[PDB]
Symmetry: D2
């Protein structure tokens, strides 16, 4: 009952920007151009930071996958976030989601706010509340869906709609969790589709990178200027590796879905799980919303284990397939306790409100055999709660 899959995604991920006629060798795979500078004198490239062959191939590919006209690659997701924020002036205000990635939370609240920028954390799941926070000084709205890690889902089309009623306000959707294979914020009314390519996009846990796709011509020109002016650019080798990862994004995300769905269903029917949060499950508060704006779900499964902090640790330390580590979206399965780990960078009084207790566990289900993933979870839960 999900949105129909995007019509040329696999084809484009493999060929867009990859045209062999670009190179004198007619190579089927684009060469890695490390060169910082390029010969001028008799069009073309001037300096690597402003633009370079391998990065441009990647940006054109990602643009296509987002259904965008333009895309910009960055040193990291946070670097992309910071660059986007530099679009504004001293005196402007940013409305940010209350449950956001810790680093995003940290930048807005602790760094950006001390340069004449106003920051308001607003529950944008309450779309009725967003309008109340909007002021004539609001220039940017930052949204993330699903949120990390409580995975609450936001109506992008509804939010874009509220935001665009008051003229020049920018709507940014952090699309790190889903990827453009499952969700296209720009097609849903967003102005900017932002990624941490470090996660699902690259999908191989070996590249730190950010991506920003956009349609507005003037917004692109401002973003392209800041990309070269701030210089938070990615390595050409990282660009190549990420572009290589995109080649299998469609077949990777499908297995994440199948494995994620299977893990979520196993966990929900398990007597030692208090509650499971997974958009693909009917038990999810926004399951029907997900189906309207998304073409599927990922391998990100959040759940509460029964008992105390003690049980969550025994569970995590007895896993043999899931690796106890931060980050997500890789081919390998990851497990994590946000209260102590990825979201220790979010205030304690805010964690109590968001639901990040000592028993909330975030899983990044990988591409291993389903059987083995379930068996690993079963054995580990039995370690915390033995027969």
């Amino acid at each position: 009952g999900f949105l129909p899959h995007f019509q040329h995604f696999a084809t484009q991920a493999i060929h867009v920007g990859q045209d062999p006629e670009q190179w004198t060798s007619r190579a089927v795979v684009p060469p890695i151009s490390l060169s910082t500078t390029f010969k001028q004198g008799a069009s073309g490239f001037t300096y690597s930071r402003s633009g370079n062959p391998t990065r441009n191939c990647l940006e054109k590919a990602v643009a296509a996958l987002d259904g965008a006209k333009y895309c910009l690659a960055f040193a990291s997701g946070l670097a992309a976030t910071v660059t986007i924020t530099h679009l504004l002036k001293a005196g402007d205000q940013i409305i940010c989601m209350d449950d956001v990635y810790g680093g995003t939370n940290r930048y807005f609240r602790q760094v950006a706010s001390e340069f004449g920028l106003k920051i308001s954390f607003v529950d944008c799941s309450k779309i009725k509340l967003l309008e109340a926070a909007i002021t004539p000084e609001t220039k940017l709205v930052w949204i993330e869906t699903p949120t990390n890690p409580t995975q609450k889902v936001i109506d992008i089309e509804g939010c874009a709609h509220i935001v665009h009623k008051h003229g020049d306000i920018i709507l940014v959707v952090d699309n790190t969790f889903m990827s453009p294979y499952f969700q296209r914020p720009l097609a849903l009314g967003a102005d900017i589709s932002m990624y941490s390519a470090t996660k699902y996009m690259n999908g191989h846990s070996d590249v730190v990178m950010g991506l920003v796709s956009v349609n507005c011509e003037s917004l692109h020109n401002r973003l392209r200027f800041l990309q070269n002016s701030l210089g938070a650019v990615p390595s050409p080798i990282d660009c190549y590796l990420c572009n290589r990862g995109l080649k299998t994004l469609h077949v990777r995300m499908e297995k994440h879905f199948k494995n994620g769905m299977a893990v979520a269903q196993f966990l929900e029917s398990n007597p030692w799980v208090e509650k499971v949060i997974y958009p693909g499950l009917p038990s999810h508060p926004q399951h029907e919303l997900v189906k309207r704006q998304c073409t599927g779900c990922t391998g990100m499964v959040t759940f509460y284990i029964k008992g105390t902090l003690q049980h969550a640790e025994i569970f995590l330390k007895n896993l043999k397939l899931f690796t106890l580590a931060v980050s997500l979206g890789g081919f390998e399965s990851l497990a994590e306790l946000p209260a102590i780990m990825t979201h220790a960078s979010v205030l304690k009084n805010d964690r109590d409100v968001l639901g990040i207790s000592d028993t909330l566990i975030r899983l990044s289900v990988g591409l291993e055999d389903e059987e083995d993933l379930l068996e690993d979870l079963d054995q580990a839960l039995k370690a915390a709660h033995p027969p």
Copy 2:
């Protein structure tokens, strides 16, 4: 008559951070660790996430720190990324004093971007010390200088400048040491708070890495920078870090050849009848030549000069070069030539270049590591081509 060369420089560039006991394999060369994340909570722990820190980047930072005579170092995605990150130390309401002649991008960030966030920017000629003193306010938190400047190669008394800045209040002096490199100049040893590099140029020296480097001694200053490195995320690729560290292994023998080639080129151009004026710190004709010898252990391959005539004559010269490549950037093993007014400094107002002297006949050369004989031959023929 230059400052004596820094001791153990080559030894440290090859060994610091490269210690084989870090790895289970006892490899002589540090592995490239691409992994974005790391396993936590195991029986019997340093790394958590690549952006915060990772093996290959850390080895590079420890090595560069040593070459700078520093305690700490931070690597970044680019020189500009390093610059922007440093500026994030400040608050809305602070003022930045910047050298009047600096790299266009440094100029551009301060004038067009930093000025959009409650920061006041004044461009001041910091070589003339009275101009700096009048610009300092109780609100001043940052002074950004570059020496030699890009591309007119103006030289600033670093130790003298630090003395003025560190007198009244908490003001940070940053020295963009891209041109010289730590082999020839140590700003931290001269009183600067930060020695900053674009590793894209001489540090890596192989024209295949875009990267910035930031060296510092102050403990609180480092912690604020280390926070911003992870919080802003302008991080370099581990593979780029490896390549740059590899470039460092030959930094000492490269810079020596850059010097020897650079001096010969400067001397050739100044005696050439088709050249109006040469600016090179190694030449006694440089207004601050004796200052250079007091602050440096030598000079690099950056040679700036004026060709006789107008813009048309400069173009014919540049297009006739066969070894020098008409291109932007600098500090690589290959020789580069460029016209700053139209190229690297087109992002500087037309009215500022005339004040700074960046006319249409000003040419910047980045002399590489090719044979001396051949580089002179290329310059000679091209000058004969410009004025036949």
Copy 3:
């Protein structure tokens, strides 16, 4: 109706050799160790062994259901190394329809160091036994063949070969990959790969792989790996190991797309004949289901008309790229008579069925519609 999929395959492909506890940093992904040498006072020299290559070798061995595996600079390099196992004076029985370079090595190079090479149709149970001599020490087979895709019953072949005892049976398992076929589980002594194809699967690594169970065979192979020095780069090893991580989800899509392409071509009025193991029309379709867990993306077909029609078709493709090699994420198309099998003598090319009208497709991971639409449009250009 195929053989059941190999158990724990995806799990092993992602985790075997990838243990974070190997590194002081506990990185989830193994670092690329370029270091040629190591401090002594473990590893000694990169060519003999190194962390990144060794991690890859443990992974491939598991996927093969093997005890050992050796990585090499290329597929041919792996073949040459294996051939160095033999003695002066011996004979090699090699299939008549093999990869061109394999043919060339045996016929033009290997034969000159006291090695005798006889090309034999190893599918004919009576032709193989007649070719075996007490002097034969090595039998080299490839299944399915390139590009006529002839299929060999491996276990009976193993059974026939091992009756004469110490003879090595090598199966070039490049086409299928260890995800779809396990020669070692079927009685082969060596499972050999060109990792340049499906194993890496991203058209950016040249590498060979050799899997083995026998202790004595391994020690001889390991000695030769270090002695000839046709070793792969650690970065290539990393890249191939990176590619292995998605082998299971890639091969499944190659299967789904290849099947769709094969079926489209067969019902097409401008195609004379389609050769694809996944189609019931393939003469050994049922043998495939008994020894394999599925099929790959290699689709061979004859276009109606002449060489001219095959050329018009190939040059009008917009998604398929006219190029050699195979097994990458991108779709490739090729005319073996003129291209990849130009290194095989011409009159044997005619007997094998590799005419001027035989076309080989390597179907990639693109969308099915676009692949089919591209084929339709290109066929309509040849035959409007």
Copy 4:
């Protein structure tokens, strides 16, 4: 009194094959081309990576210039180059190899090549009349090393070339690994093949295993080019890039290796705890005067015998703090090693004849500061003989 330095070396090492007009982007440094295959149809271009590819060709084009050669072939390793060269022959032919060669070179000929109808004779080619006594019409290949590994015996290449080429068709190969093409050009001295282990000085950064073969003869190149593609011991394009990158600083590296190597050699000879030093740059070297005629300088390879027994050699090696106890050579880092147990353990009765005793130590002097390298040796020697 050495040969004048080869002219335009720095220019060529930096520019040959590196022409920015090769790429549509006009990049100053050649891109790394990983692609295994190339689009065909529209004469122009590449077909398959193993046969040839942009990045490998640029390196080969570059190395050829530095060798003063017309052609060059890159391989997966030095040994890969060796095995490929040997494949030029047939069963029944005979190979003349230097008596003191690298352990792996010895091992291949003796244990592998010898099992395929090849005749192998180990001959002291520094005494050149021994070369003539072993030559037979069955000789198709002469493999020499100068200086030898690790006793550093020096061979008159042109003299050998004269003797070898007098008789029908014998190929003379010079393993020019120790010296660099900056310091020695075998092809200009009459050799048929200039071969390298690029793992050492050529790359010079201890992170690439690679072999190189430079050649002038047309038929010889065509036969080798066939084998490069047919045997498939090809290097990775990224490794090719890395070696080409290392090549950019080869001249300034080799000069510093020389200055450090000479100082290290001079220090050891004046040291009361060293019995004998073997270094071509030293007048005490038997072929010192020969070296000056065929070379433009010397490298950082210093071989010496320490006084005492095996235990004294161990304490010395284990007390080094700058020199690293490891195998291989030619990198920016200083290496120290005991060949009898390590790099030449694959050669024992032959070690005794060659002089590779339990007290023979081989040093690869790196690019560190001279003083620091000297102090490390000084302190470590004081440690063995306390």
